[PDB]
């Protein structure tokens, strides 16, 4: 059984290779998740076929309980695995299984170097330095749902300054950080990737929340626990570190 | 079925309550893991009986493949769950199952405030500031097994300065940090706990490795995936944050 692996284009996890050489099938792609998948294939001993999710979505539910994206591909048995920056969440575990996480990440702060600002508390208690998140993303939604007082005050500031404080996308937010007195709230993984590529930029404070990326499978898949085992081996033998360093480290 | 829960005394996860009031059974204990267990019990709907692991060990293997500690209790079906600061590891997954992690942690650096030192690379390339780990602990073993060049150089320094660089326990290491020009390599969780209680002390840099604490069960336990689900709900609804803050925050 050649496993069908659903995935999604997302730098640096999954990209098309910058080549016009005759590359076919899996060889068309590169990235952290391609390297991970290769390692998993060699530990477990499976053949695989990478297929980009047709609708280009991660996977969310509508009011009728209908799913889309990579999650739908798993539910429909049109993919055996989902290998992507795919968050292990309560709602998704209702409908698919996940390996244990190959990466753990949390919301943090992207800001300039050389300022007395050291935490989210430092931003919360002032208004001179503006801060926000990508509109309608996971990070904005976190602040919107939070009952923690300091993040409620932070959401109050973001929501009241809606037009300016919230950006269209991560690229816009980084530009806002680079050009204006602005701090962007974004996933730690993304901050690490950006700060490696922008020496004027830095992470501020630690993680504001916590979640993991895991390999998705249909409910009951006999590959799930095997993939957990392989992930633990890669973790312990320093290979996940090596793969992260390969893709994250800047000039 | 009242579940037997194996655990281990370890501040602030599991402690005896500072009380001479008539407290029996589970009520004798307090701590992060007791709070977690209470939440799990209320989500899943189980009764439970907390029993300290008789040998006071986490769980390791001998040459005959014989286990001890909480892992042995699970293998022997003398406990249904292990709820403790118990690391999810490749070797343990061979013999027990684990929920997804309720806490994610990594080796980091404990040092004084106000120095130009900002990372492990800063320590590695000098000898004036001495650094090390607890002798024969997980953190020392990491550096001993690492193939990463900067941690090989760090291990070289720790091993050559064996007598002084390596400490007997965490308490000794903290005292060495407080009294000498010394940086201690220790788990991020422990650093957070200590820095909340010592205003002169701080964390240096980020995580050097990554691992998770999970709830242990016997292989095939029908509680494992339910506990994962409960953990995800607690994570997403900010309750794990609240429980960590309850036990970690200092004066
Ligand atoms: N992990 C998410 C999708 N995903 C993937 C990546 Br990579 C990522 O950086 N993010 C974060 C993100 C994307 C758009 S806004 C935003 C945010 O953190 O605010 C994400 O939500 C999921 O599983 O749905
Ligand atoms: N998690 C470990 C046991 N354990 C528990 C806690 Br709390 C802890 O801080 N550590 C770290 C530790 C303990 C003695 S030395 C050391 C270290 O990090 O070097 C640990 O190994 C296991 O599961 O065996
Ligand atoms: Cl699992």
Curated annotation (Swiss-Prot), chains A, B:
<feature type="binding site">
    <location>
        <position position="87"/>
    </location>
    <ligand>
        <name>L-glutamate</name>
    </ligand>
</feature>
<feature type="modified residue" description="Phosphothreonine; by PKC">
    <location>
        <position position="195"/>
    </location>
</feature>
<protein>
    <recommendedName>
        <fullName>Glutamate receptor ionotropic, kainate 1</fullName>
    </recommendedName>
</protein>
<comment type="subunit">
    <text>Homotetramer or heterotetramer of pore-forming glutamate receptor subunits. Tetramers may be formed by the dimerization of dimers. Can form functional heteromeric receptors with GRIK4 and GRIK5. Interacts with KLHL17.</text>
</comment>
<feature type="binding site">
    <location>
        <position position="139"/>
    </location>
    <ligand>
        <name>L-glutamate</name>
    </ligand>
</feature>
<feature type="topological domain" description="Extracellular">
    <location>
        <begin position="116"/>
        <end position="251"/>
    </location>
</feature>
<feature type="binding site">
    <location>
        <position position="85"/>
    </location>
    <ligand>
        <name>L-glutamate</name>
    </ligand>
</feature>
<comment type="similarity">
    <text>Belongs to the glutamate-gated ion channel (TC 1.A.10.1) family. GRIK1 subfamily.</text>
</comment>
<comment type="function">
    <text>Ionotropic glutamate receptor that functions as a cation-permeable ligand-gated ion channel, gated by L-glutamate and the glutamatergic agonist kainic acid. L-glutamate acts as an excitatory neurotransmitter at many synapses in the central nervous system. Binding of the excitatory neurotransmitter L-glutamate induces a conformation change, leading to the opening of the cation channel, and thereby converts the chemical signal to an electrical impulse. The receptor then desensitizes rapidly and enters a transient inactive state, characterized by the presence of bound agonist.</text>
</comment>
<feature type="glycosylation site" description="N-linked (GlcNAc...) asparagine">
    <location>
        <position position="200"/>
    </location>
</feature>
<feature type="binding site">
    <location>
        <position position="138"/>
    </location>
    <ligand>
        <name>L-glutamate</name>
    </ligand>
</feature>
<feature type="binding site">
    <location>
        <position position="92"/>
    </location>
    <ligand>
        <name>L-glutamate</name>
    </ligand>
</feature>
<feature type="modified residue" description="Phosphoserine; by PKC">
    <location>
        <position position="159"/>
    </location>
</feature>
<feature type="binding site">
    <location>
        <position position="187"/>
    </location>
    <ligand>
        <name>L-glutamate</name>
    </ligand>
</feature>
């Amino acid at each position: 059984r050649t496993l069908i692996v659903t995935t999604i284009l997302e730098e640096p996890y999954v990209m098309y290779r910058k080549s016009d050489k005759p590359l076919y099938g899996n060889d068309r792609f590169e990235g952290y998740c391609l390297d991970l998948l290769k390692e998993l294939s060699n530990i477990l001993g499976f053949l695989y076929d990478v297929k980009l999710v047709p609708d280009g979505k991660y996977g969310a539910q509508n009011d009728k309980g209908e799913w889309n994206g990579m999650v739908k591909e798993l539910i429909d048995h049109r993919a055996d695995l989902a290998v992507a920056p795919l968050t292990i969440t309560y709602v998704r575990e209702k409908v698919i299984d996940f390996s244990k996480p190959f990466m753990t990440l949390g919301i943090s702060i992207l800001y300039r170097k050389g300022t007395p600002i050291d935490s989210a508390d430092d931003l919360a208690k002032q208004t001179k330095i503006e801060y926000g998140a990508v509109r309608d993303g996971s990070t904005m939604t976190f602040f919107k749902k939070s009952k923690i007082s300091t993040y409620e005050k932070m959401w109050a500031f973001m929501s009241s300054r809606q037009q300016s404080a919230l950006v269209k996308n991560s690229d816009e937010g980084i530009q806002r950080v680079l050009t204006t007195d602005y701090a962007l709230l974004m996933e730690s993984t993304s901050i690490e990737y950006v700060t490696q590529r922008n020496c004027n930029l830095t992470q501020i404070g630690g993680l504001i929340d916590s979640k993991g990326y895991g390999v998705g499978t249909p409910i009951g898949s006999p590959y799930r626990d095997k993939i957990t085992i392989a992930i633990l081996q890669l973790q312990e033998e320093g290979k996940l570190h090596m793969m992260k360093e390969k893709w994250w480290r800047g000039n």
